[PDB]
Design an enzyme around this catalytic site. Structure first.
Site, PDB file in Angstrom:
ATOM      1  N   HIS A 154      77.140  75.676   4.718  1.00 34.61           N
ATOM      2  CA  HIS A 154      75.918  75.234   4.035  1.00 34.61           C
ATOM      3  C   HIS A 154      74.659  75.394   4.911  1.00 34.61           C
ATOM      4  O   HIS A 154      73.572  75.173   4.404  1.00 34.61           O
ATOM      5  CB  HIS A 154      76.036  73.822   3.444  1.00 34.61           C
ATOM      6  CG  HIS A 154      75.989  72.702   4.435  1.00 34.61           C
ATOM      7  ND1 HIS A 154      77.120  71.983   4.755  1.00 34.61           N
ATOM      8  CD2 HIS A 154      74.934  72.175   5.100  1.00 34.61           C
ATOM      9  CE1 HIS A 154      76.728  71.050   5.614  1.00 34.61           C
ATOM     10  NE2 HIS A 154      75.418  71.121   5.841  1.00 34.61           N
ATOM     11  N   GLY A 211      71.540  66.238   9.853  1.00 35.54           N
ATOM     12  CA  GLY A 211      71.535  66.997  11.097  1.00 35.54           C
ATOM     13  C   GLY A 211      72.847  66.915  11.862  1.00 35.54           C
ATOM     14  O   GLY A 211      73.073  67.710  12.780  1.00 35.54           O
ATOM     15  N   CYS A 267      75.824  67.554  10.582  1.00 35.23           N
ATOM     16  CA  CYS A 267      76.818  68.541  10.142  1.00 35.23           C
ATOM     17  C   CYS A 267      77.148  69.532  11.244  1.00 35.23           C
ATOM     18  O   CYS A 267      76.269  69.896  12.047  1.00 35.23           O
ATOM     19  CB  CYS A 267      76.400  69.232   8.856  1.00 35.23           C
ATOM     20  SG  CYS A 267      75.987  68.072   7.540  1.00 35.23           S
TER      21      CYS A 267
HETATM   22  C1  LIG Z   1      72.585  63.458   4.816  1.00 33.15           C
HETATM   23  C2  LIG Z   1      73.892  63.428   5.566  1.00 33.15           C
HETATM   24  C3  LIG Z   1      74.323  62.262   6.191  1.00 33.15           C
HETATM   25  C4  LIG Z   1      75.545  62.243   6.831  1.00 33.15           C
HETATM   26  N1  LIG Z   1      76.363  63.300   6.893  1.00 33.15           N
HETATM   27  C5  LIG Z   1      75.953  64.430   6.304  1.00 33.15           C
HETATM   28  C6  LIG Z   1      74.741  64.545   5.629  1.00 33.15           C
HETATM   29  N2  LIG Z   1      74.387  65.739   4.956  1.00 33.15           N
HETATM   30  C7  LIG Z   1      74.867  66.126   3.756  1.00 33.15           C
HETATM   31  O1  LIG Z   1      75.721  65.529   3.118  1.00 33.15           O
HETATM   32  C8  LIG Z   1      74.233  67.415   3.185  1.00 33.15           C
HETATM   33  F1  LIG Z   1      73.001  67.112   2.684  1.00 33.15           F
HETATM   34  F2  LIG Z   1      74.009  68.283   4.209  1.00 33.15           F
HETATM   35  C9  LIG Z   1      75.106  68.070   2.147  1.00 33.15           C
HETATM   36  C10 LIG Z   1      74.871  67.883   0.790  1.00 33.15           C
HETATM   37  C11 LIG Z   1      75.746  68.396  -0.156  1.00 33.15           C
HETATM   38  C12 LIG Z   1      76.868  69.105   0.244  1.00 33.15           C
HETATM   39  C13 LIG Z   1      77.070  69.317   1.593  1.00 33.15           C
HETATM   40 CL1  LIG Z   1      78.442  70.251   2.113  1.00 33.15          CL
HETATM   41  C14 LIG Z   1      76.205  68.820   2.545  1.00 33.15           C
END
Ligand SMILES: Cc1ccncc1NC(=O)C(F)(F)c1cccc(Cl)c1
Ligand SMILES: Cc1ccncc1NC(=O)C(F)(F)c1cccc(Cl)c1
Lengths: 304, 304
Positions: free
Chosen positions: A41, A143, A145
């Protein structure tokens, strides 16, 4: 003496963390040998995440579009490929800090340490369990990820998790290092059901043994039970059914303490039925399930 | 989202760990620049620990008696000196892995990460608090002496603790890096009273703010209190009296959540008086005091 939710020393993993940027999005990458692994992503914009066609999105990207930075070191990308939900960026330099490593797919109920990173920089390390429903209850913000989960045996780092997303419920989902999600999750901004979770019975029993080893013995009783009887109680309290395989892995702890596994099951049965009566076990007022029997043996012996 | 008992990434500290052997005893040393710091009881035999005369024991030792090994690297000792309860072994080589560092004496109620080591090898990392009574509730076995506690700001490691001993009660005692014990402890095998401990009020309040930030809000109420009224409750429940200095450090969390510090004090007052009623806060069934207000701001923002 003392028992703590101990994480592996994160040094070997810190040396592998890089920042990966593609267009507008920045996240963490793992640099092992001449390959950088990161969530796919990274190629999406916020608008793409609603229903991304990753194959089409990756076609608009070239090697020079993936900016990989190891702090001050800029890596030259000579290849890119998508494997499941991960991108593999071939770089022209092998990471001099690459430790001995393996990629493993852990089982639900197993534990691992997470090195939470932001912009390729480590911020903290914590131990957690892969829930029976394939989620992790981590601590991650935007951030994070690309931050990875791992275990370390001797000098070998077994990478088992890469963080991808936070579910609407505040729990976390990710993949193995081949990019296969744990659980039914898809890398898309859509509400997704996590399965019904259960408490990891074998781990609670392991932690009750760690409590006895460290002096917290108040919960020990004069009773015993059977696998059948215990499992009727586990069913009522949403605990995983205990199997002979679980009893077998508790053998070393049963052997060290001289408390038969079914005798420990009767203590757990009484704690489930009566609660803790305002008392604590190893500084906890609930039944802890984030220590495997191996974690207990390791911590209780002093394995480095 | 999510809140975890996060430790600092231990990499910078792992690069400093060495094994120190003197006669029959082996423990951990910290190699910073051309000096190796370790507990002075490395010079004792089991029989010496009853009432050791360290000055006399160290007089029978020469530079060549201190064997310092950084895994495979053997260090040449060119000087030795005792400073309070630590030995400083001057070596002929500066540690190439020496990070930017400071030696600090932390205050009771502050937190730090511990890198538990055995024979100079790291086994695990965990976060803990220096109790108001100057003990730590760590996880240490024989051979863990010399393991250190630290905090990391940017690229600087502030070493604050070196593990020396386990009290008969299973709690831990150690020194700052100048060898001064935290608390009234002496490095001798004698029963030693740890002071009456208290719960770190400012930390519990910080953790209640972290709970609100992460969605656990059930404990919020329609009440408020005063410092005077709250302190009468803190006194009854063996909590540290809250001061304006504590209220001032909770300012950023009060500002982020819009919940006045005295309004949060009234939630804590009700939780003290009524208990948790079988509920949990951030996965805990007790009031957690091992997160400082700074730890909460750091974790909740994503500081690397
Ligand atoms: C905001 C956050 C907080 C904690 N851990 C990760 C995140 N980020 C996310 O979930 C994302 F916005 F990057 C995302 C949205 C939809 C699908 C995917 Cl794969 C990834
Ligand atoms: C056995 C253990 C377990 C955990 N943490 C430390 C230890 N070790 C000790 O307490 C000691 F035996 F080395 C000792 C005894 C008396 C004084 C001093 Cl300074 C040190």
């Amino acid at each position: 003496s003392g028992f703590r939710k101990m994480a592996f020393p994160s040094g070997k993993v810190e040396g592998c963390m890089v920042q990966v940027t593609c267009g507008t999005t920045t996240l963490n990458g793992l640099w092992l040998d001449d390959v950088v692994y990161c969530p796919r992503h990274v190629i999406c914009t916020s608008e793409d995440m609603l229903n991304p066609n990753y194959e089409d999105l990756l076609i608009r990207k070239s090697n020079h579009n993936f900016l990989v930075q190891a702090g001050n070191v800029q890596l030259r990308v000579i290849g890119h490929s998508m494997q499941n939900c991960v991108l593999k960026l071939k770089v022209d330099t092998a990471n001099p800090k690459t430790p001995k490593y393996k990629f493993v797919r852990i089982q639900p109920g197993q534990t691992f340490s997470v090195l939470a990173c932001y912009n390729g920089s480590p911020s903290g390390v914590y131990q957690c369990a892969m829930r029976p429903n394939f989620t992790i209850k981590g601590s991650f913000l935007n951030g994070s990820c690309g931050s990875v989960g791992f275990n370390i045996d001797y000098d070998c780092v077994s990478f088992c998790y890469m963080h991808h997303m936070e579910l609407p419920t505040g729990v976390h989902a990710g993949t193995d290092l081949e990019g296969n999600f744990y659980g039914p999750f898809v890398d898309r901004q859509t509400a997704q059901a996590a399965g019904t979770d259960t408490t990891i019975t074998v781990n609670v029993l392991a932690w009750l043994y760690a409590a006895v080893i460290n002096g917290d013995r108040w919960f020990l009783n004069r009773f015993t039970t059977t696998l059948n009887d215990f499992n009727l109680v586990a069913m009522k309290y949403n605990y995983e059914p205990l199997t002979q395989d679980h009893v077998d892995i508790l053998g070393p702890l049963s052997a060290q303490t001289g408390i038969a596994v079914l005798d420990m099951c009767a203590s757990l049965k009484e704690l489930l039925q009566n609660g803790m009566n305002g008392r604590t076990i190893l500084g906890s007022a609930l039944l802890e399930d984030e220590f495997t029997p191996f974690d207990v043996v390791r911590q209780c012996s002093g394995v480095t």
